Amino acid sequence: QYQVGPLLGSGGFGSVYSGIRVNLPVAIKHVEKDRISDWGERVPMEVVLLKKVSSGFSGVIRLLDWFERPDSFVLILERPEPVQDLFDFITERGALQEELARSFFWQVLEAVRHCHNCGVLHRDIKDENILIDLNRGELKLIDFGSGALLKDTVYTDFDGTRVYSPPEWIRYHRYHGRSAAVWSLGILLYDMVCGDIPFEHDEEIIRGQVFFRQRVSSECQHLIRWCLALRPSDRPTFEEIQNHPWMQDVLLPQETAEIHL
Numbered sequence: 417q418y419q420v421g422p423l424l425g426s427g428g429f430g431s432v433y434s435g436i437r438v439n440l441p442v443a444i445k446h447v448e449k450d451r452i453s454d455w456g457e458r459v460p461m462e463v464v465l466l467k468k469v470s471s472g473f474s475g476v477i478r479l480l481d482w483f484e485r486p487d488s489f490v491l492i493l494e495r496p497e498p499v500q501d502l503f504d505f506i507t508e509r510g511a512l513q514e515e516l517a518r519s520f521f522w523q524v525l526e527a528v529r530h531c532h533n534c535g536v537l538h539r540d541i542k543d544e545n546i547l548i549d550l551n552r553g554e555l556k557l558i559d560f561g562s563g564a565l566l567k568d569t570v571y572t573d574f575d576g577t578r579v580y581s582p583p584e585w586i587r588y589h590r591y592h593g594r595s596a597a598v599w600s601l602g603i604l605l606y607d608m609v610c611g612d613i614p615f616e617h618d619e620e621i622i623r624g625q626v627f628f629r630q631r632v633s634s635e636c637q638h639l640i641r642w643c644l645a646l647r648p649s650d651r652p653t654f655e656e657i658q659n660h661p662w663m664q665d666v667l668l669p670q671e672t673a674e675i676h677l
């Protein structure tokens with residue numbers, strides 16, 4: 417049913433190949449049964465999570481199908497072409513212009529709101545888990561493998577990216593969903609405007625003091641420092657982020673593509 421192309425990447429979860437449906441581009445993701453920690457209804461949680469979010473259009477990668485095998489699951493995912501993940505795109509072009517960071521950040525926030533509206537919390541938002549559809553100028557979120565059903569009580573597990581994790585996890589091994597998500601969005605927007613993440617080490621995370629290494633407007637610094645408030649409840653809601661003066665007059669993905677890509 418698919419034509420396996422070349423390997424696109426791999427970790428200790430699995431391996432993802434480029435592929436063609438027999439005519440659409442897809443990505444074929446192989447996950448080891450040995451290596452899954454969280455299961456759902458029996459399937460890897462990613463599958464539960466993607467079915468929940470994969471209705472309709474959005475800035476989330478769609479699950480086209482999946483298969484079980486003796487020792488592994490295989491997920492069949494949308495693949496835009498051409499595409500570049502945001503970690504790459506930042507490595508290559510350095511810190512982004514504010515206008516482009518605003519366009520990308522908005523789309524991320526729309527994708528994250530959509531997951532929450534569907535009861536899904538991603539738990540590993542970061543540049544590497546974001547794909548850019550270069551022709552249309554649209555961002556898509558990938559890798560729901562550390563996700564969870566969204567809930568209002570405390571989380572005690574985390575298998576996301578440490579440097580993107582908030583102070584309350586580092587210190588207490590506890591966080592709530594939306595507020596830990598807003599923190600990682602703070603790390604992400606800093607990453608976009610500065611070209612790298614603000615904190616490398618547990619104690620800089622706990623300290624939460626933000627130093628800017630690049631010229632960044634004041635409103636953006638304000639937004640970033642707000643998402644990165646040490647007390648969870650001092651962090652903005654998604655709505656407050658989107659009503660932030662720095663977020664006004666965002667460009668369309670298509671204008672973003674014409675100007676910047």
Ligand SMILES: O=C1/C(=C/c2c[nH]c3ccccc23)Oc2c1ccc(O)c2CN1CCCCCC1
Nearest residue numbers: 424425426432443477493494495501544558559
């Ligand atoms: O869940 C994953 C996914 C889904 C895709 C859906 N369409 C695509 C198109 C290209 C690449 C990946 C995809 O790609 C994944 C996933 C999990 C881990 C991982 O290391 C990759 C491959 N990645 C490409 C290289 C950058 C580092 C991470 C992203």
